[PDB]
Amino acid sequence: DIVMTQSPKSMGMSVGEAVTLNCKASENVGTYVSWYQQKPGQSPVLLIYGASNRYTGVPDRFTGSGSATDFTLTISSVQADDDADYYCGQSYSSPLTFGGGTKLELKRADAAPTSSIFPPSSEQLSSGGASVVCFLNSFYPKSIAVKWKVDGSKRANGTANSWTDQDSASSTYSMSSTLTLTKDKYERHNSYTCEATHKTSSSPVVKSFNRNEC
């Protein structure tokens, strides 16, 4: 089996910059190398085949070069919509094999998040549970820390955080932090607070709601 090794495992670049992705074969594969782009929630799309042939419909900014065991995919001027995982594959020898991929992320200006907090729905309370959600929207960079306070006391148990992939237009991230409690626990306290610390602000961004009105 021929092993395909993709160099940059991960990479971040700004819109308009030229980027080069590398793919090496453990042994000769001639020019039988193809490159694929896989955007979030989509199947792979063929970009280049035969090492340097651009597939029909592919934008001119994508070009390929190489032979034998060293291949490269070049993006002349990266676009925000180029955010994706890129894979090379060889079809010179059997079985066909693919490299492990290179993830291309976009760099952009720092942006402070917008915060929203949501009390549990009456529907959930009926089942005996209560999830309080804090949503941080459209920010950059990805790194952010969320702290939960109940009636002024920090709560670290029962918290679940998750991020969205980077937006294909604005290159910003979004993330939700979910605090889950039982109905009894939720009803014995009044103030629920979400505190977010991001590099854009020295002081944390706080969002809270009082059960005796929401």
């Binding site: 929203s116 949503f135 929207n137 679940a160 998750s162 991020w163 969205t164 979004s174 993330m175 939700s176």
Partner: peptide, 19 residues
């Protein structure tokens, strides 16, 4: 904005938000 699914104990959870 749909955050990625998370596995806890043995069940998944996910949230989708629209502005």
């Amino acid at each position: 904005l749909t955050v990625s699914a998370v596995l806890q104990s043995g069940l998944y959870t996910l949230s989708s938000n629209t502005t």
